[PDB]
Amino acid sequence: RPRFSFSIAAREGKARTGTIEMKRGVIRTPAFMPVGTAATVKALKPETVRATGADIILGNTYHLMLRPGAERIAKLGGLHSFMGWDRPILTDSGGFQVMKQSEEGVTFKSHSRHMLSPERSIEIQHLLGSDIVMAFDEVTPYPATPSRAASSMERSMRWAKRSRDAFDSRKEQAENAALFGIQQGSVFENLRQQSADALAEIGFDGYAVGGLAVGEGQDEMFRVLDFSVPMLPDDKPHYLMGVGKPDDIVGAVERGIDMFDCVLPTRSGRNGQAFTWDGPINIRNARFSEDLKPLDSECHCAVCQKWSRAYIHHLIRAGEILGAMLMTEHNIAFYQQLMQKIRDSISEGRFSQFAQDFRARYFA
Amino acid sequence: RPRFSFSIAAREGKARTGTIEMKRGVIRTPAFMPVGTAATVKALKPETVRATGADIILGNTYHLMLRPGAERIAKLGGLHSFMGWDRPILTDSGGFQVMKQSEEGVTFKSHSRHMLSPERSIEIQHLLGSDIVMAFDEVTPYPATPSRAASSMERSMRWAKRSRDAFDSRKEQAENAALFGIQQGSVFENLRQQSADALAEIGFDGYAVGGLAVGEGQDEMFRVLDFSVPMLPDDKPHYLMGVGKPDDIVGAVERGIDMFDCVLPTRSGRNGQAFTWDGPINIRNARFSEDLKPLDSECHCAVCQKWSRAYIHHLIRAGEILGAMLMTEHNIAFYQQLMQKIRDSISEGRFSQFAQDFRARYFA
Ligand SMILES: NCc1c[nH]c2nc(N)[nH]c(=O)c12
Ligand SMILES: NCc1c[nH]c2nc(N)[nH]c(=O)c12
Ligand SMILES: [Zn+2]
Ligand SMILES: [Zn+2]
């Protein structure tokens, strides 16, 4: 396999399906990336993560630098070796978790004093041995005034160039990993356009839509995606960071997004929320205490093959670790089955029908 | 397979190795039973418990009756079905967790008001669908005066007869499960003898040594085992309840014990303690932060095949669920490997040498 090759196999409207080939493996798109905060996808062995269908996972630069430490992970052979996941890993840059500041970067106290900058973020991602490296950005909160959105976007573009140069100057990283740029601009079309133009001029292997799902509603997010995604190079992956709910994902794919990550299936799994084709349920609810059905009636995951709602209800009620394990495996598997249905439907030219059918049932 | 058949294949001094055959499977002895407190061996799927080598697990009557409830489990098809473990399950009777009281039984408040008695304990164990049912006893704390030890022992023997009759009166239970009696008498030889005689007169499928590992030291426990185990019928299994550490197990086998359970490998696994052939280690210790070796250098478990001390150190430090999962799997696997080495050495007539070698290295 090459360092990086994105190929689009089929299209339907703005939606695409295809593959990213990298040295450590192939990623089928549209893709969902489980989040492995501090070198673990919570409550799952890597083999279980793979068994659910994941092709790639996400690691958080900010958290890993705080514990166990980036240099330590490098000394131990890199993140893949450390955690036992040998397929691609994407690392975020830390901009989201950040949100003293200056044009040079940021200093902050560990929740010890730490520093992030375009150069240091790229370095940490190198030390981790990331396959997909993200530019270091400044993420403005919502709502943002046009002036402040413009300032953070402009700084992010200067930082995107610094990220590009840092990545390129490190031969081993440049030859073996990929670098994605991050579009900013809040909800403003003109700023989103300026940001897309700046990133395309610099040139990246992929383009993330940053700064969404930070407090604007789905309607607004979709409105911004409507104009923002077409601004990005068509022939590279489009990554919507930190999204999201199943319906968010479907609508974002309809608008040209190829990659997703979110803590929702894992975090809310531990909390008792299980995804089903008829919408989410909270397994802690008393109505499930004697329900012998699986979490979802169609799901092919090992959890739905083997255990009842009643059992998982008890485990979560009781605070048992196995409850977190089973909920998380099911939810991640559900997400991967959603992505597979999306990929197949686009391939077969029936994605619009799938989206309609999905919504009708999920929100019944 | 029969309802119950214990066969002794080989002996060395007081030590024995053999098999218990039951309808749901064969149990190799000496046996270690992982404890599954409230219908789960903490942090492990049942398939993982089996993969470590366990032939049987223990469930706690007291806890299960409180949550999710015995009647509820019965309605859902029994404990095996509920938790997904299809091999034998032994249930304790509740006497240990108990320790208003009367000759009829005990009432207590949930940590709702609940009741236990010989009849109710046997009933709960039936509702759970237990394969090995334990008589309901009264467990005196250590130290005990001779008078109080005698009173609790005598009550326990009356309760053993009530347990026997309750079990026998329930045809489905009598035909498909086994019933073990529990010897009491604290540290007193005469009381232990009276208790053994009473239990043998009633007749049970197996005999537990109760009331030890409740505050007396290993020396005292071993002294009591020295005279107590030979009092029990030789041709039935001997079960030392709530023991214990690897060295406890080895010494108890040397004294004629066939079955063990304890929370130690699971509970202390979650706390950071890993068993090794060179003694226990606490993985949280800073000395392990960059140690690339497996938990134990010889252990054949999947954890030792795949992850380093450094990684598990980080997980436990961070409070990650995967840390509990990996520690627990390793510790249970270690215990099963200990039992296998014990069984093989007795079979081969070299158990005394094994015990000496084990101690020399474990305590080096
Ligand atoms: N939802 C927005 C988001 C999530 N993670 C992120 N990481 C970075 N660097 N930038 C961003 O805008 C975001
Ligand atoms: N270590 C003693 C012990 C553990 N569990 C027990 N359960 C019962 N019923 N009786 C006992 O004596 C014990
Ligand atoms: Zn499922
Ligand atoms: Zn091991």
Residue numbers in the entry:
A (entry chain A), B (entry chain A): 11 to 109, 116 to 127, 131 to 383
Publication text:
Transfer RNA–guanine transglycosylase (Tgt, EC 2.4.2.29) catalyses the exchange of a specific guanine base in tRNA molecules by a substituted 7-deazaguanine. Bacterial Tgt functions as a homodimer in which the protomer consists of a (βα)8 barrel harbouring a Zn2+ binding subdomain close to the C-terminus. The reaction follows a ping-pong mechanism including a covalent Tgt⋅tRNA intermediate. Hence, in an attempt to generate a model system for the active site of human Tgt and to gain insights into the relevance of particular amino acids for substrate base selectivity, we adapted the Z. mobilis Tgt active site by site-directed mutagenesis in order to mimic that of the human enzyme.
Next, we analysed and compared the structures of the studied Tgt variants in complex with preQ1. Superimposition of the structural models reveals that preQ1 is identically positioned in all investigated variants including “wild type” Tgt (mean rmsd = 0.20 Å±0.07 Å). In “wild type” Tgt this cavity harbors two well-ordered water molecules which are displaced in the Tgt(Cys158Val)·preQ1 complex structure by the isopropyl side chain of Val158. A conspicuous structural change upon binding of preQ1 is observed within the binding pockets of those Tgt variants which harbour the Cys158Val mutation. Both in Tgt(Cys158Val) and Tgt(Cys158Val/Val233Gly) the binding of preQ1 provokes a shift of Val158 towards the ligand enabling five Van-der-Waals interactions of its isopropyl side chain with the 7-deazaguanine scaffold of preQ1 (3.5 Å to 4.3 Å calculated by CONTACSYM). In addition, a noticeable change of the proximate Thr159 whose side chain is rotated by about 90° is observed. So far, in no other crystal structure of Z. mobilis Tgt or any variant thereof such a conformational change of Thr159 has been observed upon ligand binding. Notably, in the preQ1 complexes of Tgt(Cys158Val) and Tgt(Cys158Val/Val233Gly) Thr159 adopts the least populated conformer, which probably corresponds to the rotamer that is least energetically favourable. Accordingly, the side chain conformation of Thr159 induced upon preQ1 binding may well be correlated with the reduced preQ1 affinity observed upon mutation of Cys158 to valine. A notable consequence of the Cys158Val exchange is the significantly decreased affinity of the enzyme towards preQ1 but not guanine.
